[PDB]
Coordinates of N, CA, C and O in Angstrom, one line a residue:
Chain A
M1 N 6.4 -10.8 -4.4 CA 6.4 -9.7 -5.3 C 6.4 -8.3 -4.6 O 6.5 -7.3 -5.2
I2 N 6.3 -8.3 -3.3 CA 6.4 -7.2 -2.5 C 7.7 -7.2 -1.7 O 8.0 -8.2 -1.0
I3 N 8.5 -6.1 -1.7 CA 9.7 -6.1 -0.9 C 9.3 -5.3 0.4 O 8.8 -4.2 0.3
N4 N 9.7 -5.8 1.6 CA 9.6 -5.2 2.8 C 10.8 -4.5 3.3 O 11.7 -5.1 3.6
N5 N 10.8 -3.2 3.2 CA 11.9 -2.3 3.7 C 11.6 -1.9 5.1 O 12.3 -1.0 5.6
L6 N 10.6 -2.5 5.7 CA 10.2 -2.0 7.1 C 11.3 -2.2 8.0 O 11.6 -1.2 8.7
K7 N 11.9 -3.3 8.0 CA 13.0 -3.5 8.9 C 14.2 -2.5 8.5 O 14.9 -1.9 9.3
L8 N 14.4 -2.4 7.1 CA 15.5 -1.6 6.7 C 15.2 -0.1 7.1 O 16.2 0.5 7.7
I9 N 14.0 0.3 6.9 CA 13.6 1.6 7.4 C 13.5 1.7 8.9 O 13.9 2.7 9.5
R10 N 12.9 0.7 9.5 CA 12.7 0.7 10.9 C 14.0 0.9 11.6 O 14.1 1.6 12.6
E11 N 15.1 0.2 11.2 CA 16.4 0.3 11.7 C 16.9 1.7 11.6 O 17.6 2.2 12.4
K12 N 16.6 2.4 10.5 CA 17.2 3.7 10.2 C 16.6 4.7 11.4 O 17.4 5.4 11.9
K13 N 15.4 4.6 11.7 CA 14.9 5.3 12.8 C 15.0 4.6 14.2 O 14.7 5.1 15.2
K14 N 15.5 3.3 14.1 CA 15.7 2.5 15.3 C 14.4 2.3 16.1 O 14.4 2.3 17.3
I15 N 13.3 2.2 15.4 CA 12.0 2.0 16.0 C 11.8 0.5 16.4 O 12.1 -0.4 15.6
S16 N 11.4 0.2 17.6 CA 11.3 -1.1 18.1 C 10.1 -1.8 17.5 O 9.1 -1.1 17.1
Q17 N 10.1 -3.1 17.3 CA 9.0 -3.8 16.7 C 7.8 -3.6 17.5 O 6.7 -3.3 17.0
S18 N 8.0 -3.7 18.8 CA 7.0 -3.5 19.8 C 6.4 -2.1 19.7 O 5.2 -1.9 19.8
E19 N 7.3 -1.1 19.4 CA 6.9 0.2 19.2 C 6.0 0.3 18.0 O 4.9 0.8 18.1
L20 N 6.6 -0.2 16.9 CA 5.8 -0.3 15.6 C 4.5 -1.0 15.9 O 3.5 -0.6 15.5
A21 N 4.6 -2.1 16.5 CA 3.4 -2.9 16.9 C 2.5 -2.1 17.7 O 1.2 -2.0 17.4
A22 N 3.0 -1.3 18.7 CA 2.2 -0.5 19.5 C 1.6 0.6 18.6 O 0.4 0.9 18.8
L23 N 2.4 1.1 17.7 CA 1.9 2.1 16.8 C 0.7 1.5 15.9 O -0.3 2.2 15.7
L24 N 0.8 0.3 15.6 CA -0.1 -0.3 14.8 C -1.3 -0.9 15.7 O -2.3 -1.4 15.2
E25 N -1.0 -0.7 17.0 CA -2.0 -1.2 18.0 C -2.2 -2.7 17.8 O -3.4 -3.2 17.9
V26 N -1.2 -3.4 17.4 CA -1.3 -4.9 17.1 C -0.2 -5.6 17.8 O 0.8 -5.0 18.2
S27 N -0.3 -6.9 17.9 CA 0.7 -7.7 18.6 C 2.0 -7.6 17.9 O 2.1 -7.4 16.6
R28 N 3.1 -7.7 18.6 CA 4.5 -7.6 18.1 C 4.7 -8.6 17.0 O 5.3 -8.3 15.9
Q29 N 4.2 -9.8 17.3 CA 4.4 -10.9 16.3 C 4.0 -10.5 14.9 O 4.6 -10.9 13.9
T30 N 3.0 -9.5 14.9 CA 2.5 -9.1 13.6 C 3.7 -8.3 12.9 O 4.1 -8.7 11.8
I31 N 4.4 -7.5 13.6 CA 5.5 -6.8 13.1 C 6.6 -7.8 12.9 O 7.3 -7.7 11.9
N32 N 6.8 -8.6 13.8 CA 7.9 -9.7 13.7 C 7.7 -10.4 12.5 O 8.6 -10.7 11.7
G33 N 6.4 -10.8 12.2 CA 6.1 -11.5 11.0 C 6.2 -10.7 9.8 O 6.7 -11.1 8.7
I34 N 5.8 -9.5 9.8 CA 5.7 -8.6 8.7 C 7.1 -8.2 8.2 O 7.3 -8.2 7.0
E35 N 8.0 -7.9 9.1 CA 9.4 -7.6 8.6 C 9.9 -8.7 7.8 O 10.8 -8.5 6.9
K36 N 9.4 -9.9 7.9 CA 9.7 -11.0 7.1 C 8.7 -11.3 6.0 O 7.6 -11.0 6.1
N37 N 9.1 -11.9 5.0 CA 8.3 -12.2 3.8 C 7.3 -13.3 4.2 O 6.8 -14.0 3.4
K38 N 6.9 -13.4 5.6 CA 5.9 -14.4 6.0 C 4.6 -14.0 5.3 O 3.9 -14.8 4.7
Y39 N 4.3 -12.7 5.4 CA 3.0 -12.2 4.8 C 3.2 -10.7 4.8 O 4.0 -10.1 5.5
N40 N 2.5 -10.0 3.9 CA 2.5 -8.6 3.9 C 1.4 -8.0 4.7 O 0.3 -8.5 4.8
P41 N 1.7 -6.8 5.2 CA 0.7 -6.1 6.0 C -0.6 -5.6 5.2 O -0.4 -5.5 4.0
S42 N -1.7 -5.5 5.9 CA -2.9 -5.0 5.2 C -2.6 -3.6 4.8 O -1.7 -2.9 5.2
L43 N -3.4 -3.2 3.8 CA -3.3 -1.9 3.2 C -3.4 -0.8 4.3 O -2.5 0.0 4.4
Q44 N -4.5 -1.0 5.0 CA -4.6 -0.1 6.1 C -3.5 -0.1 7.1 O -2.9 0.8 7.5
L45 N -3.0 -1.4 7.6 CA -2.0 -1.6 8.4 C -0.7 -1.0 7.8 O 0.1 -0.4 8.4
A46 N -0.5 -1.3 6.6 CA 0.8 -0.9 5.8 C 0.8 0.6 5.7 O 1.9 1.3 6.0
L47 N -0.3 1.2 5.5 CA -0.4 2.7 5.5 C -0.1 3.2 6.9 O 0.6 4.2 7.0
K48 N -0.7 2.6 7.9 CA -0.3 3.0 9.3 C 1.2 2.9 9.5 O 1.8 3.9 10.1
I49 N 1.8 1.9 9.0 CA 3.2 1.7 9.2 C 4.0 2.9 8.5 O 4.8 3.5 9.1
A50 N 3.5 3.1 7.3 CA 4.1 4.2 6.5 C 3.9 5.5 7.2 O 4.8 6.4 7.4
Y51 N 2.7 5.7 7.8 CA 2.4 6.9 8.5 C 3.3 7.0 9.7 O 3.8 8.0 10.0
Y52 N 3.4 5.9 10.4 CA 4.3 5.8 11.7 C 5.7 6.1 11.2 O 6.4 6.9 11.8
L53 N 6.1 5.5 10.2 CA 7.5 5.7 9.6 C 7.6 7.1 9.1 O 8.7 7.6 9.0
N54 N 6.5 7.7 8.8 CA 6.4 9.0 8.2 C 7.2 9.1 6.9 O 8.0 9.9 6.6
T55 N 7.1 8.0 6.2 CA 7.7 7.8 5.0 C 6.7 7.1 4.0 O 5.8 6.4 4.5
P56 N 6.8 7.4 2.7 CA 5.7 6.8 1.8 C 5.8 5.3 1.8 O 6.9 4.7 2.0
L57 N 4.6 4.7 1.7 CA 4.5 3.2 1.8 C 5.4 2.6 0.8 O 6.0 1.5 1.0
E58 N 5.5 3.1 -0.4 CA 6.2 2.5 -1.5 C 7.7 2.3 -1.2 O 8.3 1.3 -1.5
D59 N 8.2 3.2 -0.4 CA 9.6 3.2 0.1 C 9.7 2.0 1.0 O 10.8 1.3 1.1
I60 N 8.6 1.7 1.8 CA 8.7 0.7 2.8 C 8.3 -0.6 2.2 O 9.0 -1.6 2.4
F61 N 7.2 -0.6 1.5 CA 6.7 -1.8 0.8 C 6.6 -1.4 -0.7 O 6.0 -0.5 -1.1
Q62 N 7.3 -2.2 -1.5 CA 7.3 -2.0 -2.9 C 7.0 -3.2 -3.7 O 7.4 -4.3 -3.4
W63 N 6.3 -3.0 -4.8 CA 6.0 -4.1 -5.7 C 7.1 -4.5 -6.7 O 7.9 -3.6 -7.0
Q64 N 7.3 -5.7 -7.0 CA 8.3 -6.2 -7.9 C 7.8 -6.7 -9.1 O 7.0 -7.5 -9.2
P65 N 8.3 -6.2 -10.3 CA 7.9 -6.7 -11.6 C 8.2 -8.1 -11.8 O 9.2 -8.6 -11.2
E66 N 7.3 -8.9 -12.4 CA 7.5 -10.3 -12.7 C 7.6 -10.6 -14.2 O 7.5 -9.8 -14.9
Chain B
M1 N -11.8 1.7 6.3 CA -10.6 2.4 6.9 C -9.6 2.8 5.8 O -8.7 3.6 6.1
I2 N -9.9 2.4 4.7 CA -9.1 2.9 3.5 C -10.0 3.8 2.6 O -11.0 3.3 2.1
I3 N -9.5 5.0 2.3 CA -10.2 5.8 1.4 C -9.5 5.7 0.1 O -8.3 5.8 0.0
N4 N -10.3 5.5 -1.0 CA -9.8 5.2 -2.3 C -9.9 6.5 -3.2 O -11.0 6.9 -3.6
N5 N -8.7 7.1 -3.5 CA -8.7 8.2 -4.3 C -8.3 7.8 -5.7 O -8.1 8.8 -6.6
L6 N -8.3 6.5 -6.0 CA -8.0 6.1 -7.3 C -9.0 6.5 -8.3 O -8.7 7.1 -9.4
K7 N -10.2 6.4 -8.0 CA -11.3 6.8 -8.8 C -11.2 8.3 -9.1 O -11.4 8.7 -10.2
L8 N -10.9 9.1 -8.0 CA -10.7 10.5 -8.1 C -9.5 10.9 -8.9 O -9.5 11.6 -9.9
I9 N -8.4 10.3 -8.4 CA -7.1 10.6 -9.0 C -7.0 10.1 -10.5 O -6.5 10.8 -11.3
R10 N -7.5 8.9 -10.7 CA -7.4 8.3 -12.0 C -8.1 9.2 -13.0 O -7.6 9.4 -14.2
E11 N -9.3 9.7 -12.7 CA -10.0 10.6 -13.5 C -9.3 12.0 -13.7 O -9.3 12.5 -14.8
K12 N -8.6 12.4 -12.7 CA -7.8 13.7 -12.7 C -6.8 13.6 -13.8 O -6.7 14.5 -14.6
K13 N -6.1 12.5 -13.8 CA -5.1 12.3 -14.9 C -5.6 11.7 -16.1 O -4.9 11.4 -17.0
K14 N -7.0 11.6 -16.2 CA -7.7 11.1 -17.3 C -7.2 9.7 -17.8 O -7.3 9.3 -18.9
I15 N -6.8 8.9 -16.9 CA -6.4 7.5 -17.2 C -7.8 6.6 -17.1 O -8.6 6.8 -16.1
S16 N -8.0 5.8 -18.1 CA -9.2 5.1 -18.1 C -9.0 3.9 -17.2 O -7.9 3.6 -16.9
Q17 N -10.1 3.3 -16.8 CA -10.0 2.1 -16.0 C -9.3 1.1 -16.7 O -8.4 0.4 -16.2
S18 N -9.6 1.0 -18.0 CA -9.0 0.1 -19.0 C -7.6 0.5 -19.2 O -6.7 -0.4 -19.3
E19 N -7.3 1.8 -19.2 CA -6.0 2.2 -19.3 C -5.0 1.7 -18.2 O -4.1 1.0 -18.4
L20 N -5.6 2.0 -17.0 CA -4.9 1.5 -15.8 C -4.9 -0.1 -15.9 O -3.8 -0.7 -15.6
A21 N -6.0 -0.7 -16.2 CA -6.1 -2.1 -16.3 C -5.1 -2.6 -17.3 O -4.4 -3.6 -17.1
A22 N -5.0 -2.0 -18.4 CA -4.1 -2.3 -19.4 C -2.6 -2.2 -18.9 O -1.8 -3.0 -19.2
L23 N -2.4 -1.1 -18.2 CA -1.1 -0.8 -17.7 C -0.7 -1.9 -16.7 O 0.4 -2.5 -16.7
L24 N -1.7 -2.3 -15.9 CA -1.5 -3.4 -14.9 C -1.6 -4.8 -15.6 O -1.4 -5.8 -14.9
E25 N -2.1 -4.8 -16.8 CA -2.3 -6.0 -17.6 C -3.4 -6.8 -16.8 O -3.2 -8.0 -16.5
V26 N -4.4 -6.1 -16.3 CA -5.5 -6.9 -15.6 C -6.8 -6.5 -16.2 O -7.0 -5.5 -16.9
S27 N -7.8 -7.3 -15.9 CA -9.2 -7.1 -16.4 C -9.7 -5.7 -15.8 O -9.2 -5.3 -14.8
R28 N -10.5 -5.0 -16.6 CA -11.0 -3.7 -16.2 C -11.6 -3.8 -14.8 O -11.4 -3.0 -13.9
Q29 N -12.4 -4.9 -14.7 CA -13.2 -5.1 -13.5 C -12.2 -5.0 -12.2 O -12.6 -4.6 -11.2
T30 N -11.0 -5.5 -12.4 CA -10.1 -5.4 -11.3 C -9.9 -4.0 -10.9 O -10.0 -3.7 -9.8
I31 N -9.6 -3.1 -11.8 CA -9.6 -1.7 -11.6 C -10.8 -1.2 -11.1 O -10.9 -0.5 -10.1
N32 N -11.9 -1.6 -11.7 CA -13.2 -1.1 -11.5 C -13.7 -1.4 -10.1 O -14.2 -0.6 -9.4
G33 N -13.4 -2.7 -9.7 CA -13.7 -3.1 -8.3 C -12.9 -2.2 -7.3 O -13.5 -1.8 -6.2
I34 N -11.6 -2.0 -7.6 CA -10.8 -1.2 -6.7 C -11.3 0.2 -6.6 O -11.4 0.8 -5.5
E35 N -11.7 0.9 -7.7 CA -12.2 2.2 -7.7 C -13.7 2.3 -7.3 O -14.2 3.4 -7.3
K36 N -14.2 1.1 -7.0 CA -15.5 1.0 -6.6 C -15.6 0.7 -5.1 O -14.6 0.8 -4.4
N37 N -16.8 0.2 -4.6 CA -16.9 -0.1 -3.2 C -16.7 -1.6 -3.0 O -17.0 -2.1 -1.9
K38 N -16.2 -2.3 -4.0 CA -16.1 -3.7 -4.0 C -15.1 -4.1 -3.0 O -15.4 -4.7 -1.9
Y39 N -13.8 -3.9 -3.3 CA -12.7 -4.4 -2.5 C -11.5 -3.5 -2.6 O -11.4 -2.7 -3.7
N40 N -10.6 -3.5 -1.7 CA -9.3 -2.7 -1.7 C -8.4 -3.5 -2.6 O -8.4 -4.6 -2.8
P41 N -7.5 -2.7 -3.2 CA -6.4 -3.3 -4.1 C -5.5 -4.2 -3.3 O -5.1 -3.8 -2.3
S42 N -4.9 -5.1 -4.0 CA -3.8 -5.9 -3.4 C -2.7 -5.0 -3.2 O -2.5 -4.0 -4.0
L43 N -1.8 -5.2 -2.2 CA -0.7 -4.3 -1.9 C 0.2 -4.3 -3.2 O 0.5 -3.2 -3.6
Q44 N 0.5 -5.4 -3.8 CA 1.3 -5.4 -5.0 C 0.5 -4.7 -6.1 O 1.1 -3.8 -6.7
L45 N -0.8 -4.9 -6.2 CA -1.6 -4.2 -7.2 C -1.7 -2.8 -7.0 O -1.5 -1.9 -7.9
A46 N -1.8 -2.4 -5.7 CA -2.0 -1.1 -5.3 C -0.7 -0.3 -5.6 O -0.7 0.8 -6.2
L47 N 0.4 -1.0 -5.3 CA 1.7 -0.4 -5.7 C 1.9 -0.2 -7.2 O 2.3 0.8 -7.7
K48 N 1.4 -1.3 -8.0 CA 1.4 -1.1 -9.4 C 0.5 0.0 -9.9 O 0.9 0.8 -10.8
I49 N -0.6 0.2 -9.2 CA -1.6 1.2 -9.6 C -0.9 2.6 -9.4 O -0.9 3.4 -10.2
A50 N -0.3 2.7 -8.2 CA 0.4 3.9 -7.9 C 1.5 4.1 -8.8 O 1.7 5.3 -9.4
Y51 N 2.3 3.1 -9.0 CA 3.5 3.2 -10.0 C 3.1 3.6 -11.4 O 3.6 4.5 -11.9
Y52 N 2.1 2.9 -11.9 CA 1.6 3.2 -13.3 C 1.0 4.5 -13.4 O 1.3 5.3 -14.3
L53 N 0.2 4.9 -12.3 CA -0.3 6.2 -12.3 C 0.9 7.2 -12.1 O 0.6 8.5 -12.3
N54 N 2.0 6.8 -11.6 CA 3.0 7.7 -11.1 C 2.5 8.6 -10.1 O 2.7 9.8 -10.2
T55 N 1.8 8.0 -9.2 CA 1.1 8.7 -8.1 C 1.4 7.8 -6.8 O 1.3 6.6 -6.9
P56 N 1.8 8.4 -5.7 CA 2.1 7.5 -4.6 C 0.9 6.8 -4.0 O -0.2 7.3 -4.1
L57 N 1.1 5.6 -3.5 CA 0.0 4.8 -3.1 C -0.9 5.4 -2.1 O -2.1 5.3 -2.0
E58 N -0.2 6.1 -1.1 CA -1.0 6.7 0.0 C -1.9 7.8 -0.5 O -3.0 8.0 0.1
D59 N -1.6 8.6 -1.5 CA -2.4 9.6 -2.1 C -3.6 8.9 -2.7 O -4.8 9.5 -2.6
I60 N -3.4 7.8 -3.2 CA -4.5 7.0 -3.9 C -5.3 6.2 -2.8 O -6.5 6.2 -2.8
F61 N -4.6 5.4 -2.0 CA -5.2 4.6 -1.0 C -4.6 5.1 0.3 O -3.5 4.8 0.7
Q62 N -5.5 5.7 1.2 CA -5.0 6.2 2.4 C -5.8 5.5 3.6 O -7.0 5.2 3.4
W63 N -5.0 5.3 4.7 CA -5.6 4.6 5.8 C -6.3 5.6 6.7 O -5.9 6.8 6.8
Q64 N -7.3 5.1 7.4 CA -8.2 5.8 8.4 C -8.4 5.0 9.6 O -8.6 3.8 9.4
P65 N -8.4 5.5 10.8 CA -8.7 4.8 12.0 C -10.2 4.3 12.0 O -11.0 5.0 11.3
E66 N -10.5 3.2 12.7 CA -11.9 2.7 12.6 C -12.8 3.7 13.1 O -13.8 4.0 12.3

């Protein structure tokens, strides 16, 4: 129900997963997993990603009507 | 690490907990817990709350470093 535009956005600024991971101060695998519908980032983590992206979270992560 | 402005924002726009709950089609407690000290909103729910509020998620739920 959540769309992850992190990769879509991340590629726009060409930020490395490791960079994003470093920005989140978390393991890359977290980013590697997050870009994928494996699981969604925590609200705090997601906000950090949005902060790092300097883009609103909603643009990066969006909820989908069911 | 998350500061919840839902309680503050929701009241600013005079949306009732029930109103938001009704908009999200959820029990009031779900909203109430979120705007309380209980628990943070689900990412999908948080997005819905922001969306229904027509307020960005970050404004409502913002991340803070530990």
